[PDB]
Design a protein around this ligand. Structure first.
Ligand SMILES: *[C@@H]1O[C@H](CO[C@@H]2O[C@@H](C)[C@@H](O)[C@@H](O)[C@@H]2O)[C@@H](O[C@@H]2O[C@H](CO)[C@@H](O)[C@H](O)[C@H]2NC(C)=O)[C@H](O)[C@H]1NC(C)=O
Lengths: 228, 214, 77
């Protein structure tokens, strides 16, 4: 009944050192031997093995082994009094932003006297964001319709933190509106767009205004969007 | 990309069968057994198949795995809705000498017909250019399954630097939306005849193109 | 502590085995080949032992000699 739980600072600044811990319960890692690993997952992306420790409680020591792509920035260690495994990662950048999982490597039997390694128990993972972004209001730009229907919108660029809200004509225009979730750039700044599809004919007659509100920066912008 | 190649998306109707390939070479799958992990939405990975073809603890019979040559395969028969998840193959690579993972495969259990994305590409606004910046905005909506690949081109050359692309997010109609941004300087924007956003969905690529001189 | 490879970080490919038990503090052993015609491993693993080749007599005879990666196949019950 082994269980694992990661914990970390949630946020870290570029160049700083990231420290994480993995608490083991339901068994002692120092009772005989424990092989632990860290594996991370950038949001929306796949899994990458970070490194390993093969630990022996007897001599209170372990040997480590790391993914070479980490360029020796990662170190893994054990604190047996706390039944804990740790990850330390130096000189972080945006590339190190990810969910970080700890897991156990177990040699599993195939029923013929043979064994193969797999990560048979995983933690729930802890999210880590590498950012030095501070509060910042967005720049709002009009996205003019293309020279039956036409799409127009507003670009809401480079803001922090979430969230931003958008409406059109103060909430009078609702159908055909599509406000997209924000992208989070490597700068640590977010951007999003809102687009509305209207009849091409309405372009001359009708007025179109997007209302952007970013509370955390205390900025609020109403942008009129015109053909070009 | 990963040294192990998996399709980003496979799908079928409930009760049908899907097969997920995971291909490599002699340095990895050719010499070493393959493990598969299932990652349910919002959850951590869990061990599903190990040592090529063995079901891990409590895993139901409709999951199976096998390996041949340098390809490992995960089959899911009698698909249930709850099988909608990301699946990752995993093995040792003895050239890199480390554990490697495939890029992952999203399995969608189709609850409605497939739908091609609607793509809209906006060039930089004259306002933004005056602020000495230039953002190209590629908006992608109403697609299903919710998986796309986005690539940008300057003229006909690939562009990677300055590109940011969201993960697909579910719309209220249960189709999906995504966006991609190419952030350039005004000078870079004017250096090419055109820029294109290319969107691949279920093996088919459409493209939208904008030009500075227009 | 044992031959199973609980302290080995790296596996050995078919036809091979760890030269000796991995220890928590020694350099990880290299992989060495099974004894051709006597022992074999048909699958990658982390241990320092190969498998013994099969035998055949009991109404059975050899059909293909054991190789470093493939057990001896027998034949006629
Ligand atoms: C084993 O495969 C990898 C690359 O994976 C891919 O699949 C291969 C089978 C092949 O189709 C490639 O086109 C694919 O990229 C090889 O690793 C790459 O090696 C090159 C040069 O040596 C290196 O620059 C790349 O970064 C590696 N790719 C990755 C993704 O790491 C490897 O060379 C192949 N091995 C053999 C022995 O052929």
């Amino acid at each position: 009944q082994l269980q694992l739980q990661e914990s970390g600072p949630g946020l870290v600044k570029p160049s700083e050192t990231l420290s994480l811990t993995c608490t083991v319960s339901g068994a002692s890692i120092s009772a005989n031997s424990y092989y632990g690993v860290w594996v991370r997952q950038s949001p929306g992306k796949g899994l990458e093995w970070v490194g390993s420790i093969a630990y022996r409680g007897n001599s209170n020591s372990g040997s480590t082994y790391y993914n070479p792509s980490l360029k020796s920035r990662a170190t893994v260690s054990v604190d047996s009094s706390k039944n804990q495994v740790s990850l330390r990662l130096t000189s972080v950048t945006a590339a190190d932003t990810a969910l970080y999982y700890c897991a156990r490597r177990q040699l599993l039997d195939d029923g013929t006297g043979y064994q193969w390694a797999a990560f048979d128990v995983w933690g729930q993972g802890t999210m880590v964001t590498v950012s030095s972004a501070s509060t910042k209001g967005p720049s709002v730009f009009p996205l003019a319709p293309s020279s039956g229907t036409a799409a127009l919108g507003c670009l809401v660029k480079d803001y922090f933190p979430e969230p931003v809200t958008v409406s059109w004509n103060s909430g009078a225009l609702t159908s055909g509106v599509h406000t997209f979730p924000a992208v989070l750039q490597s700068s640590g700044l977010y951007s999003l767009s809102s687009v509305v599809t209207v009849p091409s004919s309405s372009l001359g007659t009708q007025t179109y205004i997007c209302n952007v509100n970013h509370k955390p920066s205390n900025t609020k912008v109403d942008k009129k969007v015109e053909p070009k | 990309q990963s040294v192990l190649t998996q399709p980003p998306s496979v799908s079928e109707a409930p009760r049908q069968t899907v097969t997920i390939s995971c291909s490599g070479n002699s340095s990895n799958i050719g010499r070493y057994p393959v493990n598969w992990y299932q990652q349910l939405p919002g959850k951590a990975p869990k061990l599903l198949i190990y040592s090529d073809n063995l079901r891990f603890s409590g895993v139901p019979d409709r999951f199976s795995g096998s390996k041949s040559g340098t390809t490992a395969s995960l089959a899911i028969r009698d698909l249930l809705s709850e099988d909608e998840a990301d699946y990752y193959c995993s093995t040792w690579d003895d050239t890199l000498e480390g554990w490697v993972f495939g890029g992952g495969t999203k399995v969608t259990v189709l609850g409605q017909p497939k739908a091609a994305p609607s793509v809209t590409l906006f060039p930089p606004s004259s306002e933004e250019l005056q602020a000495n910046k230039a953002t190209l905005v590629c908006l992608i909506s109403d697609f299903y399954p919710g998986a796309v690949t986005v690539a940008w081109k300057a003229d006909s050359s690939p562009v990677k630097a300055g590109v940011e692309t969201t993960t697909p997010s579910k719309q209220s109609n249960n189709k999906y939306a995504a966006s991609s941004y190419l952030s350039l300087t005004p000078e870079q924007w004017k250096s090419h005849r055109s820029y294109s956003c290319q969107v691949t969905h279920e093996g088919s690529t459409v493209e939208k193109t904008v030009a500075p001189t227009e | 502590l044992h031959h199973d490879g609980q302290f080995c970080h790296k596996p050995c490919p078919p036809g091979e085995r760890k030269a000796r038990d991995c220890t928590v503090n020694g350099d990880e052993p290299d992989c060495v080949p099974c004894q051709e015609g006597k022992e074999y491993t048909d699958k990658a693993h982390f241990s320092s032992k190969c498998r013994r080749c099969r035998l055949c007599g009991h109404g059975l005879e050899v059909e293909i000699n054991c190789t470093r990666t493939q057990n001896t196949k027998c034949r006629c019950c």
